Design a protein around this motif. Structure first.
Motif, PDB file in Angstrom:
ATOM      1  N   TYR A   1       0.840  -1.177   0.000  1.00  0.00           N
ATOM      2  CA  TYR A   1       0.000   0.000   0.000  1.00  0.00           C
ATOM      3  C   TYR A   1       0.880   1.233   0.000  1.00  0.00           C
ATOM      4  CZ  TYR A   1      -3.893  -3.097   1.236  1.00  0.00           C
ATOM      5  OH  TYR A   1      -4.832  -4.105   1.277  1.00  0.00           O
ATOM      6  N   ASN A   2       0.691   2.079  -1.007  1.00  0.00           N
ATOM      7  CA  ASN A   2       1.465   3.290  -1.148  1.00  0.00           C
ATOM      8  C   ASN A   2       0.642   4.456  -0.620  1.00  0.00           C
ATOM      9  OD1 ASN A   2       2.750   5.633  -2.019  1.00  0.00           O
ATOM     10  ND2 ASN A   2       3.550   4.647  -3.869  1.00  0.00           N
ATOM     11  N   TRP A   3       0.942   4.869   0.603  1.00  0.00           N
ATOM     12  CA  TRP A   3       0.171   5.890   1.291  1.00  0.00           C
ATOM     13  C   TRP A   3       0.435   7.299   0.756  1.00  0.00           C
ATOM     14  CZ3 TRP A   3      -3.941   4.331   3.722  1.00  0.00           C
ATOM     15  CH2 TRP A   3      -3.992   2.998   4.132  1.00  0.00           C
ATOM     16  N   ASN A   4       1.367   7.421  -0.185  1.00  0.00           N
ATOM     17  CA  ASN A   4       1.501   8.649  -0.970  1.00  0.00           C
ATOM     18  C   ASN A   4       0.530   8.687  -2.141  1.00  0.00           C
ATOM     19  OD1 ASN A   4       4.833   7.980  -0.311  1.00  0.00           O
ATOM     20  ND2 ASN A   4       3.753   9.727   0.569  1.00  0.00           N
ATOM     21  N   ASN A   5       0.100   7.519  -2.612  1.00  0.00           N
ATOM     22  CA  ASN A   5      -0.907   7.424  -3.662  1.00  0.00           C
ATOM     23  C   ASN A   5      -2.336   7.368  -3.104  1.00  0.00           C
ATOM     24  OD1 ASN A   5       1.033   7.338  -5.711  1.00  0.00           O
ATOM     25  ND2 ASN A   5       0.942   5.100  -5.921  1.00  0.00           N
ATOM     26  N   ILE A   6      -2.501   6.857  -1.878  1.00  0.00           N
ATOM     27  CA  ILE A   6      -3.798   6.789  -1.212  1.00  0.00           C
ATOM     28  C   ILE A   6      -3.985   8.138  -0.512  1.00  0.00           C
ATOM     29  CG2 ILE A   6      -5.244   5.593   0.416  1.00  0.00           C
ATOM     30  CD1 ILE A   6      -3.269   3.162   0.084  1.00  0.00           C
ATOM     31  N   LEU A   7      -4.616   9.064  -1.215  1.00  0.00           N
ATOM     32  CA  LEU A   7      -4.725  10.445  -0.773  1.00  0.00           C
ATOM     33  C   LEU A   7      -5.785  10.596   0.307  1.00  0.00           C
ATOM     34  CD1 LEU A   7      -4.566  12.204  -4.234  1.00  0.00           C
ATOM     35  CD2 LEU A   7      -2.701  11.734  -2.672  1.00  0.00           C
ATOM     36  N   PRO A   8      -5.730  11.708   1.064  1.00  0.00           N
ATOM     37  CA  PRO A   8      -6.712  11.913   2.137  1.00  0.00           C
ATOM     38  C   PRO A   8      -8.120  12.184   1.626  1.00  0.00           C
ATOM     39  CG  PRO A   8      -4.861  13.471   2.318  1.00  0.00           C
ATOM     40  CD  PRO A   8      -4.644  12.707   1.083  1.00  0.00           C
ATOM     41  N   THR A   9      -8.246  12.726   0.429  1.00  0.00           N
ATOM     42  CA  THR A   9      -9.557  12.901  -0.165  1.00  0.00           C
ATOM     43  C   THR A   9      -9.395  13.010  -1.669  1.00  0.00           C
ATOM     44  OG1 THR A   9     -11.678  14.072   0.051  1.00  0.00           O
ATOM     45  CG2 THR A   9      -9.713  15.422  -0.153  1.00  0.00           C
ATOM     46  N   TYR A  10     -10.519  12.896  -2.366  1.00  0.00           N
ATOM     47  CA  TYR A  10     -10.559  12.880  -3.824  1.00  0.00           C
ATOM     48  C   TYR A  10     -11.673  13.782  -4.276  1.00  0.00           C
ATOM     49  CZ  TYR A  10      -7.397   8.986  -3.737  1.00  0.00           C
ATOM     50  OH  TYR A  10      -6.299   8.204  -3.486  1.00  0.00           O
ATOM     51  N   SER A  11     -11.356  14.684  -5.188  1.00  0.00           N
ATOM     52  CA  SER A  11     -12.385  15.544  -5.748  1.00  0.00           C
ATOM     53  C   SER A  11     -12.413  15.532  -7.273  1.00  0.00           C
ATOM     54  CB  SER A  11     -12.242  16.971  -5.220  1.00  0.00           C
ATOM     55  OG  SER A  11     -10.996  17.510  -5.602  1.00  0.00           O
ATOM     56  N   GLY A  12     -11.570  14.710  -7.896  1.00  0.00           N
ATOM     57  CA  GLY A  12     -11.666  14.445  -9.316  1.00  0.00           C
ATOM     58  C   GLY A  12     -10.403  14.576 -10.136  1.00  0.00           C
ATOM     59  N   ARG A  13      -9.542  15.537  -9.820  1.00  0.00           N
ATOM     60  CA  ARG A  13      -8.371  15.792 -10.654  1.00  0.00           C
ATOM     61  C   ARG A  13      -7.181  14.916 -10.319  1.00  0.00           C
ATOM     62  NH1 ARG A  13      -7.642  21.525 -13.643  1.00  0.00           N
ATOM     63  NH2 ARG A  13      -9.811  22.282 -13.554  1.00  0.00           N
ATOM     64  N   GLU A  14      -7.366  13.962  -9.416  1.00  0.00           N
ATOM     65  CA  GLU A  14      -6.299  13.043  -9.062  1.00  0.00           C
ATOM     66  C   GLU A  14      -5.949  12.142 -10.239  1.00  0.00           C
ATOM     67  OE1 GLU A  14      -9.303  13.173  -7.357  1.00  0.00           O
ATOM     68  OE2 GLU A  14      -8.612  14.673  -5.914  1.00  0.00           O
ATOM     69  N   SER A  15      -4.751  11.579 -10.218  1.00  0.00           N
ATOM     70  CA  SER A  15      -4.342  10.662 -11.262  1.00  0.00           C
ATOM     71  C   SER A  15      -5.083   9.336 -11.156  1.00  0.00           C
ATOM     72  CB  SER A  15      -2.845  10.397 -11.178  1.00  0.00           C
ATOM     73  OG  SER A  15      -2.567   9.587 -10.050  1.00  0.00           O
ATOM     74  N   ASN A  16      -5.095   8.595 -12.250  1.00  0.00           N
ATOM     75  CA  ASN A  16      -5.689   7.275 -12.194  1.00  0.00           C
ATOM     76  C   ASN A  16      -4.980   6.359 -11.210  1.00  0.00           C
ATOM     77  OD1 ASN A  16      -7.796   7.919 -13.894  1.00  0.00           O
ATOM     78  ND2 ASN A  16      -6.550   7.529 -15.713  1.00  0.00           N
ATOM     79  N   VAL A  17      -3.661   6.467 -11.117  1.00  0.00           N
ATOM     80  CA  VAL A  17      -2.924   5.688 -10.126  1.00  0.00           C
ATOM     81  C   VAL A  17      -3.441   5.997  -8.717  1.00  0.00           C
ATOM     82  CG1 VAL A  17      -0.679   5.511  -8.963  1.00  0.00           C
ATOM     83  CG2 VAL A  17      -0.817   5.274 -11.456  1.00  0.00           C
ATOM     84  N   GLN A  18      -3.661   7.270  -8.415  1.00  0.00           N
ATOM     85  CA  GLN A  18      -4.165   7.648  -7.103  1.00  0.00           C
ATOM     86  C   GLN A  18      -5.588   7.163  -6.857  1.00  0.00           C
ATOM     87  OE1 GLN A  18      -3.342  11.787  -7.636  1.00  0.00           O
ATOM     88  NE2 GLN A  18      -1.325  11.658  -6.680  1.00  0.00           N
ATOM     89  N   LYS A  19      -6.436   7.255  -7.870  1.00  0.00           N
ATOM     90  CA  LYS A  19      -7.808   6.757  -7.758  1.00  0.00           C
ATOM     91  C   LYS A  19      -7.834   5.246  -7.573  1.00  0.00           C
ATOM     92  CE  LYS A  19      -9.781  10.610 -10.336  1.00  0.00           C
ATOM     93  NZ  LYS A  19     -10.493  11.027 -11.567  1.00  0.00           N
ATOM     94  N   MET A  20      -6.990   4.547  -8.311  1.00  0.00           N
ATOM     95  CA  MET A  20      -6.937   3.100  -8.174  1.00  0.00           C
ATOM     96  C   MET A  20      -6.368   2.689  -6.816  1.00  0.00           C
ATOM     97  SD  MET A  20      -8.474   1.666 -10.550  1.00  0.00           S
ATOM     98  CE  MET A  20      -9.166   1.974 -12.167  1.00  0.00           C
TER      99      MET A  20
END
Length: 254
Positions: A95-114
């Motif tokens: 688990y990459n906790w730099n990719n698992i962001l604290p929140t998502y509002s849409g402009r995140e990368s696909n890697v971050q969303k996945m």
């Protein structure tokens, strides 16, 4: 009752049950009689998964999953063809906790969303999620086990049931967690459905800060005998989650 400012808010943590949190949950296959079609939609992550995932993000833990989990959906589930088995290869997860962001509002990368969707899917599977347009789990009993056995959290993790304590001693246990900067997993049942959520603060008035896991909708201060959000999100039933309460406390890494 000590005053504790919302722990999840302090870290910007706000998750939900729909996109882009549910990109890896099962895709609904069938229409439930009497309900509009959700065929082709990803199932909701489930309140139990969203609550647990927010707390895991608070700790950014674990870096490595420990043990895989497998279960079979109930054949009573009208949304899937049966038999349907689900498997989460949690023992293989970095688990990459730099990719698992604290929140998502849409402009995140696909890697971050996945990354968040993978965590949500893994957690949901670990609690035997009954996936659908709303998604339900037994909750506490499975959450405490999953956190320890699948995700390597401390042996301090355990379920407590409201019925086993006085109001004073119940609230004192919640306060103690908050004093240790440990958000609490919590659930309850209302007249026409239950829900799981996070307790992460207190106002000194015998009210607690609640994050309902609906992306922010209805978050605020509530008494534990009046867990009655106004606006409801996915799986919200008719609110009023005041019966059969339980919590998972002691949530911290090994």
């Amino acid at each position: 009752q000590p005053v504790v400012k919302s722990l999840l808010n302090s870290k910007g943590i706000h998750y939900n049950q729909g996109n882009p949190y549910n990109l890896l949950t099962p895709v609904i296959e069938k229409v439930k009689p009497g309900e509009q079609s959700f065929v082709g939609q990803h199932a909701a992550t489930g309140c139990v998964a969203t609550a647990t995932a927010q707390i895991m993000k608070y700790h950014n833990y674990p870096n490595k999953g420990l043990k895989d989990y497998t279960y079979t959906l109930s054949s009573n589930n009208p949304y899937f063809n049966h038999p349907k088995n689900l498997f989460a290869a949690i023992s293989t997860r970095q688990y990459n906790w730099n990719n698992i962001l604290p929140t998502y509002s849409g402009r995140e990368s696909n890697v971050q969303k996945m990354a968040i969707s993978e965590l949500m899917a893994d957690v949901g599977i670990s609690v035997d999620m009954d996936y659908g347009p709303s998604s339900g789990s037994a909750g506490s009993s499975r959450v405490q086990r999953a956190l320890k056995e699948n995700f390597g959290y401390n042996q301090s993790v355990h379920q407590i049931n409201r019925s086993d304590f006085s109001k004073q001693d119940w609230e004192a246990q919640i306060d103690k967690e908050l004093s240790q900067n440990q958000p609490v997993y919590y659930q309850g049942v209302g007249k026409v459905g239950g829900h799981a959520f996070v307790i992460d603060g207190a106002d000194g008035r015998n009210f607690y800060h609640v994050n309902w896991g609906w992306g922010g909708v209805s978050d605020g201060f509530f008494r534990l005998d009046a867990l009655n959000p106004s606006a409801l999100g996915t799986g919200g039933g008719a609110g009023g989650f005041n019966g059969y309460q339980s919590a998972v406390v002691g949530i911290k890494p090994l």
